[PDB]
Amino acid sequence: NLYQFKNMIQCTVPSRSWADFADYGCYCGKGGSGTPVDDLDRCCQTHDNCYNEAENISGCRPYFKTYSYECTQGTLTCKGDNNACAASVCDCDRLAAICFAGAPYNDDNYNIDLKARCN
């Protein structure tokens, strides 16, 4: 779940508060819709798509699903005791976090006008 996604971000990207990613580009945080403003927005776009596919698994809710993971000594791991849904979600978030750690950060792309550039 997001609390866990939060904690994931905090362990792969220490130097940056997770908030920095809760309202960025067209896909990070807010809804979505439109061409990703950049790579960091692309990471999120791919993260939004991942959730939508997961939503296909019945009774699977990307935001509230509590999965099993762990982050130690710079390693983010999705555990084996997860059902199909939790596993999927975990991996979505996991891929995203790792994606975040490798993408640049443009401050101009933080909290841009969604309505005029993407709703």
């Binding site: 996604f5 939060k6 971000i9 990613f21 896909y27 990070c28 945080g29 939004d48 959730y51 935001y63």
Partner: peptide, 5 residues
């Protein structure tokens, strides 16, 4: 209380 993605 609120979201990333």
């Amino acid at each position: 209380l609120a979201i990333y993605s």
